[PDB]
Structure 1
Amino acid sequence: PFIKLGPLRNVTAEIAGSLSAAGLVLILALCLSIYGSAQFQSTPSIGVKTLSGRSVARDPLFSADGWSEFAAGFLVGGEAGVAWAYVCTQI
């Protein structure tokens, strides 16, 4: 996105587009760390069973220590994952 449509599309065009993709990453991390800050106070809450109907173990997708490692995954994935759209299109 932030390469070809931006203000410096008609020129620093991909350096311009690079760290701007690295940004919505870090804000999502605030959004997802702040999303997590409110919700989980005591234990998880999901549809426990499968389609088969037997009581399977509950997922850590929804928990106190859950969304933390996701919010971390969204950061380290995002920031690094951004760098490789401008090591391949630029460098």
Structure 2
Amino acid sequence: VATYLSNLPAYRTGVAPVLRGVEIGLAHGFLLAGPFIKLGPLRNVPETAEIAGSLSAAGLVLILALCLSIYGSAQFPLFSADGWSEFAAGFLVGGEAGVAWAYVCT
């Protein structure tokens, strides 16, 4: 939809890349914790089911944050050597916040 694609932060050109990666970070923050916290190796432990799965999911955010910075050094107002480094920074800080936001939402 041409209406909806102009809303979500991948196409908001009029936003700074720090706040852009922050909203993308939290949006994938309290969401990818879902499979680890429900059906990982610790479904049937009713105290570690929210601890280790969220701590693993924060590890996956750490991998994806490196995976973003690797792309910026490869590929090169976000598509820049600096705007992407602010983008991956906001994804790491925004992603770690959202995974802690996932554990808060218990």
TM-score by length of 1: 0.71
Deviant stretches of 4+, over 6 Å: none
Instruction: Name 2:96's counterpart in structure 1.
Output: 79
1:64 Cα deviation from its structure 2 partner: 1.4
CA–CA distance in structure 2, aligned partners of residues 63 and 4 of structure 1: 38
Contact (CA 8 Å) 2:42, 2:53: kept in 1 or not?
Answer: no
Structure 2 residue 42 is the aligned partner of structure 1 residue 25 = no
Figure out how many residues of one structure are paired with residues of the other and give that number.
70
Larger radius of gyration, structure 1 or 2?
A: 1
The structure with more helix, counted as a fraction of residues: 2
Structure showing greater relative contact order (alpha-carbon pairs closer than 8 Å, 6 or more residues apart) = 2
1:20 Cα deviation from its structure 2 partner: 1.4
Structure 2 residue 40 is the aligned partner of structure 1 residue 6 = yes
Instruction: Name 2:5's counterpart in structure 1.
Output: none
Unaligned segments of structure 2, at least 5 residues? 1-34
Q: Identity over aligned residues, as a percent?
A: 100
Unaligned segments of structure 1, at least 5 residues? 41-59
User: What RMSD in Å do the two structures reach over aligned CA positions?
Assistant: 1.0
